[PDB]
Amino acid sequence: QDTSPDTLVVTANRFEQPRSTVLAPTTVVTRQDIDRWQSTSVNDVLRRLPGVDITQLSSIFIRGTNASHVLVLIDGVRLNLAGVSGSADLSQFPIALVQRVEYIRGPRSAVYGSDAIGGVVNIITTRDEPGTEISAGWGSNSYQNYDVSTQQQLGDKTRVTLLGDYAHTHDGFLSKTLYGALEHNFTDAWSGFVRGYGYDNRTNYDTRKLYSQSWDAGLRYNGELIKSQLITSYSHSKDYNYDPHYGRYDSSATLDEMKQYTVQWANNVIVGHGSIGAGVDWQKQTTTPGTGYVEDGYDQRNTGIYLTGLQQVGDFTFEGAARSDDNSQFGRHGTWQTSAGWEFIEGYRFIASYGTSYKAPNLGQLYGFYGNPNLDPEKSKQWEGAFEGLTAGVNWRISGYRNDVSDLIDYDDHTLKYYNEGKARIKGVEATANFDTGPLTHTVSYDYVDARNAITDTPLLRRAKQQVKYQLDWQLYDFDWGITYQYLGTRYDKDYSSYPYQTVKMGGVSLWDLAVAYPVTSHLTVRGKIANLFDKDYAGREYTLSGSYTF
């Protein structure tokens, strides 16, 4: 992954800044990473990153809360995950479109609003890579993938990107995506873009057909000091779930049509040794069940306004954000965060962070099959302290955090319902490092996640307490190898066979993957992967084989 302190991210305050000036822990994944890892799903990308505990249908915890506490953006715009299945729908999003992922841990409601409690994951779909690639893959369980994309300059000012992708995984999960983007520089300072994409996913679990489209248009001003962006988005999905013996109209079939509209205006200016920024946005999500008549459905709206600042004063860096949100269902809620870094000697820094964040129950949690119209907003207070250094070629960081959540919402697989866990306290350690030894590059992370009910002190269920992630990359005789190791430690779950239901500890699981790639020609790269090398049943050993031809 991209581990340079100099790499630019946009996800911390919406505008470009070096990762080294973001005081919260950041991970950047590039399309190169994705391509080398040969990931076939967004989960395969996420599973690799600090704090993320994914077991595959998938149970995901990030820093001790379920994935709904991490806000997912596509190109800076909230991905509608307010459907019946909540954040589980992240797995419907096509890997073909992830060109980069910026992942910043820790609260960021003070910039983005509801849901950014554990972190923010921004799946960026655009990349500067002109030309044409044809890709395809085959693998275990009749896996088939075919992909064409091209990115062409249509004059000095205009760039069009087009992509189509067919993916079929066992009839299992079929997923067809199209994507087009227009990027235009009216002048050197003014730019605009229009991007549209969609996918039709068919899943046999009990048949699901999801048709989704998302359109975004934006204007950007990039001045010497002042930067502004105005973005409007619209996303629409129709989601059919039915028994194929009876079809989509059967009385027990469901159709949920969802829409999300966003208008967002963000500004930033370079001032002193840093920047300040502010922005306002309005967002609305709607859902309508079987009928198509919006009177039959529900909607939630939100208007927020936020302030951000970054300043370097001598060896100190101060960073803050504050936001106030007006939610049509939950009213007004403010959040704020601040961090201070002290580079006490060059290359080494201590960082202390504090922030509040919240999550307002969304349409699915309130009115969907699994929900409850009486859910309260979840509110979080987080403290984190970090030590990072560069030592003898080793880029490292370790932090401790604590997250006190009021009215944390967990989901109970047994009752099939969200429920309010009450007050939860998560205490955690994150360590990361990367370093090279000769031809080997090592990317390592460790997490300890101690999530408890703060009142009774009882561990929260289904969370791995430890996560070890190790990636090993090297190139030898033009073969590029990547070994991935993951350990997800011991978890607690309920044994429902006998009443009273006992809490039982589940074992940790180790999984290994081996990937290799060879540039057959300067245009043709051939890739293979063995996932779950040791065939661990705990979803066993799977192979994949693919090629790309760049024009």
UniProtKB/Swiss-Prot annotation:
Ca(2+) 2 binds at residues 171, 205-206. Disruption phenotype: No longer takes up colicins E1 and E3; colicin K uptake does not change. One of its GO terms (molecular function) is porin activity. GO terms for cellular component: cell outer membrane; membrane; pore complex; transmembrane transporter complex. Coiled coil: none annotated. The chain crosses the membrane at residues 132-139, 143-152, 158-169, 173-183, 188-204, 208-222, 224-241, 254-270, 273-282, 298-314, 316-326, 330-345, 348-362, 379-388, 394-403, 418-435, 439-454, 462-474, 480-495, 503-517, 530-538, 539-551. It comes from the Bacteria. The keyword Ion transport applies. A motif (TonB box) lies at residues 6-13. Residues 140-142, 242-253, 283-297, 327-329, 363-378, 404-417, 455-461, 496-502 are extracellular. Cyanocob(III)alamin binds at residues 57, 59, 66, 84-85, 254, 462, 496. Ca(2+) 1 binds at residue 171. Keywords: Calcium, Cell outer membrane, Ion transport, Membrane, Metal-binding, Porin, Receptor, Signal, TonB box, Transmembrane, Transmembrane beta strand, Transport. Residues 1-131, 153-157, 184-187, 223, 271-272, 315, 346-347, 389-393, 436-438, 475-479, 518-529 are periplasmic. Residues 129-551 form the TBDR beta-barrel domain. It is a multi-pass membrane protein. Calcium increases vitamin B12 binding affinity by a factor of 50-100. (Microbial infection) Colicins E1, E3 and K inhibit cyanocobalamin (CN-B12) uptake; E1 and E3 inhibit binding of CN-B12 to cells while colicin K inhibits a later, energy-dependent step of CN-B12. Induction: Constitutively expressed. Primary control of btuB expression by cobalamin occurs at the level of translation initiation. Residues 18-126 form the TBDR plug domain. HAMAP family: BtuB. Belongs to the TonB-dependent receptor family. BtuB (TC 1.B.14.3.1) subfamily. Interacts with TonB. (Microbial infection) The hairpin motif of the receptor-binding domain of colicin E3 (ColE3) interacts with BtuB without displacing BtuB's central plug. An N-terminal fragment of E3 binds OmpF; trimeric complexes with ColE3, BtuB and OmpF can be cross-linked and immunoprecipitated. This is Vitamin B12 transporter BtuB. It comes from Escherichia coli (strain K12). The lineage of its organism: Bacteria, Pseudomonadati, Pseudomonadota, Gammaproteobacteria, Enterobacterales.
